Amino acid sequence: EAPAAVVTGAAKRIGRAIAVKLHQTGYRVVIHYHNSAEAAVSLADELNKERSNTAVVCQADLTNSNVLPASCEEIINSCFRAFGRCDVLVNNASAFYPTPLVQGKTVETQVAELIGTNAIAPFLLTMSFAQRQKGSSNLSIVNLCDAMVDQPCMAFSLYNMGKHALVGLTQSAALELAPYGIRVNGVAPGVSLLPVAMGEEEKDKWRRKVPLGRREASAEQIADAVIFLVSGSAQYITGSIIKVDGGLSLVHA
Amino acid sequence: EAPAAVVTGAAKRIGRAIAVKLHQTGYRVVIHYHNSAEAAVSLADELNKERSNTAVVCQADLTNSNVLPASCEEIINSCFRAFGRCDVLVNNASAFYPTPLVQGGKTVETQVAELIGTNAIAPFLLTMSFAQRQKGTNPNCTSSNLSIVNLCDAMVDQPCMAFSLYNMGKHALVGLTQSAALELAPYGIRVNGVAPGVSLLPVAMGEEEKDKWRRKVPLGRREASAEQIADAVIFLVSGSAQYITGSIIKVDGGLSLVHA
Amino acid sequence: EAPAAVVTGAAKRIGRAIAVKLHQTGYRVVIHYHNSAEAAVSLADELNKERSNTAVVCQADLTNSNVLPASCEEIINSCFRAFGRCDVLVNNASAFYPTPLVQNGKTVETQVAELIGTNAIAPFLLTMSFAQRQKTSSNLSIVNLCDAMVDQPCMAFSLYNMGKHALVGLTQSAALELAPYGIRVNGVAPGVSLLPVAMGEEEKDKWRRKVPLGRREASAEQIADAVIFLVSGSAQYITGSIIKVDGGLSLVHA
Amino acid sequence: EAPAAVVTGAAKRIGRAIAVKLHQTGYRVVIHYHNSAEAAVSLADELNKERSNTAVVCQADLTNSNVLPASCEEIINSCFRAFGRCDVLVNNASAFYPTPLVQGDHNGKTVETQVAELIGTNAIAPFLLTMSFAQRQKGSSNLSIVNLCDAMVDQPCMAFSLYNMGKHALVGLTQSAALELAPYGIRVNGVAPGVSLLPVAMGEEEKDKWRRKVPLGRREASAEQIADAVIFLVSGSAQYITGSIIKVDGGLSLVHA
Ligand SMILES: NC(=O)c1ccc[n+]([C@@H]2O[C@H](COP(=O)([O-])OP(=O)(O)OC[C@H]3O[C@@H](n4cnc5c(N)ncnc54)[C@H](OP(=O)(O)O)[C@@H]3O)[C@@H](O)[C@H]2O)c1
Ligand SMILES: NC(=O)c1ccc[n+]([C@@H]2O[C@H](COP(=O)([O-])OP(=O)(O)OC[C@H]3O[C@@H](n4cnc5c(N)ncnc54)[C@H](OP(=O)(O)O)[C@@H]3O)[C@@H](O)[C@H]2O)c1
Ligand SMILES: NC(=O)c1ccc[n+]([C@@H]2O[C@H](COP(=O)([O-])OP(=O)(O)OC[C@H]3O[C@@H](n4cnc5c(N)ncnc54)[C@H](OP(=O)(O)O)[C@@H]3O)[C@@H](O)[C@H]2O)c1
Ligand SMILES: NC(=O)c1ccc[n+]([C@@H]2O[C@H](COP(=O)([O-])OP(=O)(O)OC[C@H]3O[C@@H](n4cnc5c(N)ncnc54)[C@H](OP(=O)(O)O)[C@@H]3O)[C@@H](O)[C@H]2O)c1
Ligand SMILES: CN(Cc1cnc2nc(N)nc(N)c2n1)c1ccc(C(=O)N[C@@H](CCC(=O)O)C(=O)O)cc1
Ligand SMILES: CN(Cc1cnc2nc(N)nc(N)c2n1)c1ccc(C(=O)N[C@@H](CCC(=O)O)C(=O)O)cc1
Ligand SMILES: CN(Cc1cnc2nc(N)nc(N)c2n1)c1ccc(C(=O)N[C@@H](CCC(=O)O)C(=O)O)cc1
Ligand SMILES: CN(Cc1cnc2nc(N)nc(N)c2n1)c1ccc(C(=O)N[C@@H](CCC(=O)O)C(=O)O)cc1
Ligand code: NI
Ligand code: NI
């Protein structure tokens, strides 16, 4: 019988590429989304046309709040309701914008969004993932990290704190959930898909920097590393974070 | 004119020892505390005994909440109020307890607020407020020695079982240390960390459990005293570390190097 | 047409498993060996029985010496003479033994030659020679076998540890320098894998216990699995990456 | 009694500033050099004019060879012979030049000479000096080793693989020796410059290119700023510190591509 996966922020871009590749591997998928309702059901439609009743949609804000644990518990619950199991969780959804230290949203909202999406939701989703299993199988969690986590971008401190917290969770959860046969790993893109709204010349500045090919990783290239980690080929791998960055983190100033 | 320093969680233990050594080095200090009012003022009394009006006290919960940015601004303000300047910020205050991922007291969101608030968010807001006050300073046109020192954890990559939120908070602190170091370098504000392995064990910990942790330590088979942690802090704030920023010094007696 | 791979120290254990999985994936293989002649040819015979003319054997000492560069050029040339190409280099051969700092009559300089040569310098020269011969339907890459415990070193293994650290450095330097040629350079870092046969089971179990995921060592095959991912089309953007295959061992404090 | 230190490659630049600061702190010093004889003897003279009988010179090639262990043993011996003790070893001497992985147009040296020089000076010599240092220990004291590492070690410069391998191996040694020598109270630490003193031969525009990369001040570290971290690590304010490598790089290693 088919395994099931939750992918967060799976409506488009890298999240969509992960849901799609997991689907092609034979997973049924919960496509989580926040604001991209149309893209999410459009994705689910295609996947369901491929194989009937193998994709459901689930919407949630993953900003930190007192109700976030409930939302995260529900996200996991939706996978079991639809599919009777939950074998894989991919923590992909992520708020991303600058927060300059020296001077719209209050700083506490930015805290809740940036740290919530990048670290607290992954933590809570991990708790619920594990709780639902215990209290053959190839259970694992993949966290979407950042290969530049130690060469941060200017004025992105909260985002960077969130990705760093995600490294800690990946390692803490790997260690703690190993007795249950739940493996916990990361995939760390460097420059992948640039923002839809980024000007082309700004995109080119980033591409130029990549030693391997002078270009960004495609969403499929990121998804490949994810499906390796969920596979039987990675049965012994846990607490490992795989850079998919084309050498970018190795390039000095 | 003597420089001034803010030290969070400075009433006891490592924070206290940092405050004492900064004061002995010539700093005026803001002693921040949460619950330890008695210890905070008795420290201030002692420092003020040595040099009149060189130690002041400041109370604040550093748990994340919608009033944290305000609280942290006021902490930095208290240093300018008392001493007319703020040269050094030491982020030492820290909540610390287990938070198991699997279950068989506080809600998990209270734990998040406390653990990531004290260890990461408050340091970040204090860093903002510290830097905002140095906005109109050109490091070329001045002879100051501004820095922040973040109290980290040498075991961040070999974490203790069931301490995931604490660990996330310390990881975020490493991220802030590095991000702030880069972003504030144009202001001549250096941002560094000191990472104890096993230092002062909890007062409530059984003596046999204490000795288990002590035995792990290759250099001397003992915990670091609070003074030895403070030595590294004062090096990092000193003129002999003027080119150091984004560095996290381990003070762990080799502990992080020991395999399972 | 079929790609070709060189695997150093390929007669036994992890190296043999890598050579086998590469061959199963469609690679022709050069099976390098040092002292394990019989094992090397029995492996070569087994793979050639599977598919004719897909396996050859190559003897070489990878200790550092004045002749080492020539040996390494010959190992690479060997793959080209046998198969007309060389798509993959796996640096697997490794000397491994204690060298205490404070006090088998091996001199320390022999220990240096053996431990640094096999783990670092031979990898570096094979990399030179590999790159030199390549100086686009191609997928060229190098995989170096590292050590997940490189920053939590075992007691009295300083030269070995220096060897492995130099290999990390080589992986990163070569990844950057060879990227313009489309040559990707990566690492697989076992923690506890195959234990020495002669080691007491009671000592083996001490190591096994340390491992969170399963309380067991990695099989050679599980290590080989990460190797074949790195060389595959599913890793075309991965260079300078070292993947731990350690079942969480490196995350366990003392 | 005054303590004693050995500093390798101490005739000039960073190694000199370390020898000077250790001398100013009250150490007697062995000034090791390879080619810089005049600068070495000139330093010994300045130090001796300040406090008589507190500085000696010792010449040795630290290229890897079958005689390197003897040479390193000699270097350590020279400290016990002059000063009756050896409290501090500073591994500073370092060969530094590109070794491209791909050749095209044919340099000077053979690749095995380059191996012997680059990894001998940066790694093997430090290892043997560490062996001899710990072996010779006699029996209030503060024994330590400081290794000069490199902050850019995981963001290597183009075509410097052998140099980078040496420096990576030196990290390994720092950590391994920290663990292994801890039971004897010998601490082993590192100082990692990013951009400090630029090569004399380097053109001014190239020098300015490196300087402008540094976030903290847009300048290189002086030799004295590097020596400061060294002297902190050998000091009593660092007695619980072992296996730590402190970056002195003005934030350079934190700058993305
Ligand atoms: N793209 C890159 O070059 C790159 C580089 C480094 C690291 N990464 C990591 O790789 C992963 C995917 O990258 P990406 O560029 O594809 O990410 P992205 O497009 O910026 O974001 C992915 C999804 O996250 C969801 N999200 C944002 N805020 C949310 C919130 N408040 N609550 C719930 N969901 C929220 C959004 O869902 P909706 O659209 O439905 O609202 C969004 O589509 C991320 O974790 C990222 O940090 C990517
Ligand atoms: N001790 C060790 O072995 C060790 C190991 C690794 C890292 N560290 C780091 O070194 C630093 C000092 O360690 P330590 O053991 O001295 O710390 P600690 O005793 O556990 O706590 C330090 C102080 O932090 C303050 N604090 C706690 N929760 C707070 C909150 N909600 N709001 C405001 N302040 C709060 C407390 O102040 P009040 O008493 O006034 O309430 C406390 O006295 C910490 O950052 C720690 O993480 C220590
Ligand atoms: N096994 C583990 O638990 C583990 C853990 C961490 C890292 N690793 C790494 O993974 C790789 C494979 O490990 P392993 O246990 O399979 O290795 P191994 O059995 O110790 O050695 C593999 C081969 O290296 C060859 N070799 C040794 N010295 C040589 C020299 N002088 N010149 C040429 N070849 C030489 C030997 O070839 P011959 O038999 O032909 O003489 C040997 O069969 C190694 O690089 C190792 O460091 C393994
Ligand atoms: N920007 C920087 O300068 C920088 C950056 C990162 C790391 N570092 C590290 O910091 C340390 C000091 O840097 P530096 O620039 O002052 O070094 P350097 O001037 O390039 O070299 C220091 C000394 O090493 C000695 N040496 C070279 N080859 C030798 C050999 N074959 N045998 C014995 N001695 C040999 C030379 O001594 P003689 O002159 O007597 O021949 C030289 O004076 C080095 O380890 C370096 O790698 C420096
Ligand atoms: C590598 N990358 C692509 C990119 C796109 N989406 C992402 N989304 C998430 N959640 N996380 C990522 N790290 C991410 N990265 C980058 C890198 C820098 C900037 C950047 O400098 N952003 C500025 C300026 C962008 C602009 O000029 O358009 C900003 O204010 O957002 C954006 C994307
Ligand atoms: C190294 N150390 C000392 C210690 C003391 N106070 C601190 N305080 C803070 N804020 N941060 C630290 N990391 C810290 N560390 C440790 C290490 C382990 C445990 C620990 O396993 N504690 C268990 C129980 C241990 C027990 O008391 O028996 C707990 O539930 O708190 C406590 C302190
Ligand atoms: C994880 N591992 C397995 C192992 C086997 N072969 C290898 N071979 C190589 N080349 N590299 C390795 N890292 C390696 N590792 C280990 C770990 C420790 C000891 C060990 O403590 N050996 C001591 C003790 C031997 C014993 O007690 O039986 C020795 O003196 O060799 C051996 C193998
Ligand atoms: C940071 N730095 C200064 C410098 C000077 N001496 C040293 N000496 C040693 N032993 N180790 C160092 N790391 C070192 N670094 C650098 C950085 C890059 C180049 C460099 O790109 N060198 C090229 C280009 C020289 C040029 O164009 O002038 C070479 O071929 O040597 C030189 C020095
Ligand atoms: Ni981190
Ligand atoms: Ni290394």
Distance between CA D205 and CA A216 in Å, rounded? 32
Q: Is B142 helix (H, G, I), strand (E, B) or coil?
A: coil
| 8 Å CB contact between D236 and B234 | no
Determined by X-ray
Contacts of A174 in chain B (CB under 8 A): none
A252 touches D: beta carbon within 8 Å: yes
Q: Is B66 helix (H, G, I), strand (E, B) or coil?
A: coil
For ligand 4, say whether the CB of D97 is within 6 Å of any of its atoms: no
The pair of structure tokens assigned to C100 is 């205490």
Residue D2 gets the label, from left (phi > 0), alpha (psi -120 to 50) or beta, of beta
Q: Which ligand is nearest to the CA of A199?
A: 5
DSSP state of A153: P
Beta bridge partners of B5: B29, B88
Contacts of A145 in chain B (CB under 8 A): none
Q: Are C251 and A237 in contact (CB < 8 Å)? A: no
DSSP state of B2: -
Distance between CA B170 and CA B72 in Å, rounded? 19
Distance between CA C143 and CA A150 in Å, rounded? 24
The pair of structure tokens assigned to C10 is 């390929």
| 8 Å CB contact between C27 and C4 | yes
Indicate the top mutation candidate among C116, C199, C211, C219 to test ligand 7's pocket, ranked by most ligand atoms within 8 A of CB.
C199
Residue type (1 letter), D157: C
Angle of helix D68-83 relative to helix C108-116, nearest 10 degrees, comes to 130
Contacts of C184 in chain A (CB under 8 A): 212
Phi/psi at D240 (5° precision): -100, 0
Distance between CA D109 and CA D120 in Å, rounded? 15
Count of other CB atoms within 10 angstroms of residue D55: 27
DSSP state of A88: E
Q: Locate tokens 């999406």: which residue?
A: A117
The pair of structure tokens assigned to C64 is 């550092």
Q: In terms of DSSP bridges, do strands A28-33 and B28-33 run parallel, antiparallel, or are they unpaired? A: unpaired
Q: Is B30 helix (H, G, I), strand (E, B) or coil?
A: strand
Which CATH number goes with the domain that contains D126? 3.40.50.720
**H or E element, residue A28:** strand A28-33
> Which are the contacts of D128, defined by CB distance < 8 A and separation ≥ 6?
C108, D68, D69, D72, D73
Nearest residue in chain C measured CA to CA from D163: C169
| 8 Å CB contact between B31 and B11 | yes
Q: Locate tokens 């068989």: which residue?
A: B104
The pair of structure tokens assigned to B258 is 């020991």
User: What domain range includes position C139?
Assistant: 1-254
The pair of structure tokens assigned to A74 is 């529900």
| Residue closest by Cα to atom 14 of ligand 4 | D14
The pair of structure tokens assigned to A64 is 């930190």
Q: Are A244 and C241 in contact (CB < 8 Å)? A: yes
**H or E element, residue B88:** strand B88-91
User: What is the longest distance spanned by two Cα atoms in chain C?
Assistant: 56
> Which are the contacts of A64, defined by CB distance < 8 A and separation ≥ 6?
A111, A112, A113, A115, A116, A120, A121, B109, B112
Distance between CA B54 and CA B44 in Å, rounded? 8
Nearest residue in chain D measured CA to CA from A153: D256
DSSP state of B224: P
* Subunit partners of chain B (3 or more CB pairs within 8 A): A, C, D
Distance between CA D225 and CA B245 in Å, rounded? 13
Q: Is B120 helix (H, G, I), strand (E, B) or coil?
A: helix
The DSSP annotation for chain D comes to ---EEEETT-SSHHHHHHHHHHHHHT-EEEEEESS-HHHHHHHHHHHHHHSTT-EEEEE---S-STTHHHHHHHHHHHHHHHHS---EEEE---------SS------S-HHHHHHHHHIIIIIHHHHHHHHHHHT-------EEEEE--TTTTSPPTT-HHHHHHHHHHHHHHHHHHHHHGGGT-EEEEEEESS-SPPTTS-HHHHHHHHTT-TTTSSPPPHHHHHHHHHHHHSGGGTT--S-EEEESTTGGG---
Indicate the number of domains in chain B: 1
The pair of structure tokens assigned to B145 is 């020695």
Q: How far is CA C40 from CA B16, B181, C8, C219, in A?
A: 65, 54, 11, 20
Residue type (1 letter), A76: I
Q: Is B125 helix (H, G, I), strand (E, B) or coil?
A: helix
**H or E element, residue B208:** helix B207-215
Q: In terms of DSSP bridges, do strands D144-148 and D187-193 run parallel, antiparallel, or are they unpaired? A: parallel
Question: Resolution to 1 decimal, in Å?
Answer: 2.2
Q: How far is CA C173 from the centre of its chain?
A: 17
> Which are the contacts of C63, defined by CB distance < 8 A and separation ≥ 6?
C95, C110, C113, C114, C117, C118
D257 touches A: beta carbon within 8 Å: yes
- From the list C100, C109, C153, the residue facing D66 with the nearest CB is C109
Burial classification of residue B26, based on how many CB atoms lie within 10 Å of its CB (0-12 exposed, 13-18 middle, 19 or more buried):
exposed
Could you write out the three-class secondary structure of chain C? CCCEEEECCCCCHHHHHHHHHHHHHCCEEEEEECCCHHHHHHHHHHHHHHCCCCEEEEECCCCCCCCHHHHHHHHHHHHHHHHCCCCEEEECCCCCCCCCCCCCCCCHHHHHHHHHHHHHHHHHHHHHHHHHHHCCCCCCEEEEECCCCCCCCCCCCHHHHHHHHHHHHHHHHHHHHHHHHCCEEEEEEECCCCCCCCCCHHHHHHHHHHCCCCCCCCCHHHHHHHHHHHHCHHHCCCCCCEEEECCCHHHCCC
Phi/psi at D114 (5° precision): -60, -40
Q: Is B44 helix (H, G, I), strand (E, B) or coil?
A: helix
The pair of structure tokens assigned to A24 is 């092609």
| 8 Å CB contact between B251 and D232 | no
**Cβ burial D37-46 (10 Å sphere, 16+ → b, else e):** eebbebbbee
Q: Locate tokens 């035995």: which residue?
A: B215
Distance between CA A63 and CA D167 in Å, rounded? 44
Rg of chain C over CA atoms, in angstroms? 18
> Which are the contacts of D199, defined by CB distance < 8 A and separation ≥ 6?
none
Distance between CA D101 and CA D84 in Å, rounded? 46
**H or E element, residue A139:** strand A139-144
C158 touches A: beta carbon within 8 Å: no
Residue D190 gets the label, from left (phi > 0), alpha (psi -120 to 50) or beta, of beta
Residue A45 known to be catalytic = no
Phi/psi at A202 (5° precision): -70, -35
Distance between CA B120 and CA A62 in Å, rounded? 19
Distance between CA A28 and CA A45 in Å, rounded? 13
The CA angle B181-D213-A206, to the nearest 5 degrees, is: 90
C-alpha dihedral, D97 to D100 to D106 to D112, nearest 10°: 70
Helices (H) and strands (E) in chain A, counts: 8, 7
Q: How many angstroms separate the first and last alpha carbons of chain A?
A: 50
Nearest to C214 by CA among A230, B100, A174: A174
Q: How many angstroms separate the first and last alpha carbons of chain B?
A: 51
Q: How far is CA D236 from CA B231, D26, D181, in A?
A: 9, 13, 18
Distance between CA D242 and CA D108 in Å, rounded? 40
Distance between CA D76 and CA D93 in Å, rounded? 15
Indicate the top mutation candidate among A91, A94, A222, A243 to test ligand 1's pocket, ranked by most ligand atoms within 8 A of CB.
A94
Q: Is B135 helix (H, G, I), strand (E, B) or coil?
A: coil
Rg of chain B over CA atoms, in angstroms? 18
Distance between CA B90 and CA B74 in Å, rounded? 15
Contacts of B162 in chain A (CB under 8 A): 176
Phi/psi at B163 (5° precision): -110, 40
Q: In terms of DSSP bridges, do strands C88-91 and C141-145 run parallel, antiparallel, or are they unpaired? A: parallel
Distance between CA D123 and CA D174 in Å, rounded? 10
| 8 Å CB contact between C83 and C4 | yes
For residue C54, the number of C-alpha atoms closer than 13 Å in the C-beta half-sphere is 20
Q: How many angstroms separate the first and last alpha carbons of chain C?
A: 51
Distance between CA A117 and CA A91 in Å, rounded? 9
Q: How far is CA B56 from CA A250, B7, B83, in A?
A: 47, 11, 9
Q: In terms of DSSP bridges, do strands C55-59 and C28-33 run parallel, antiparallel, or are they unpaired? A: parallel
Nearest to A244 by CA among A207, A218, A209: A218
Q: How far is CA B4 from CA B1, B55, B139, C179, in A?
A: 10, 9, 18, 50
Q: Is B78 helix (H, G, I), strand (E, B) or coil?
A: helix
For residue A68, the number of C-alpha atoms closer than 13 Å in the C-beta half-sphere is 26
| Residue closest by Cα to atom 31 of ligand 8 | D97
Q: In terms of DSSP bridges, do strands D88-91 and D144-148 run parallel, antiparallel, or are they unpaired? A: parallel
Distance between CA A250 and CA A132 in Å, rounded? 40
* Subunit partners of chain D (3 or more CB pairs within 8 A): A, B, C
| 8 Å CB contact between A238 and A183 | yes
DSSP state of A234: G
Instruction: Calculate how close chain C gets to B175, using CA atoms only, in Å.
Output: 19
Cross-sheet strand order for the sheet of D4-7: D55-59, D28-33, D4-7, D88-91, D144-148, D187-193, D245-248
Distance between CA D245 and CA D248 in Å, rounded? 10
Pocket around ligand 5: residues whose beta carbon is below 6 Å from it? A 94, 96-98, 146, 153, 191, 194-195, 198, 202, 206
State the closest ligand 2 atom to the C-alpha of B224, by its place in the atom list counted from 1.
Answer: 3
Instruction: Calculate how close chain C gets to D122, using CA atoms only, in Å.
Output: 11
Nearest residue in chain A measured CA to CA from C192: A236
Rg of chain A over CA atoms, in angstroms? 17
Angle of helix C13-25 relative to helix C220-231, nearest 10 degrees, comes to 40
The pair of structure tokens assigned to A249 is 């983190």
Distance between CA D235 and CA D228 in Å, rounded? 11
A109 touches B: beta carbon within 8 Å: no
D138 has binding-site annotation? no
**Entry field: residues in chain C:** 254
| 8 Å CB contact between D47 and D22 | no
Angle of helix A13-25 relative to helix A219-230, nearest 10 degrees, comes to 50
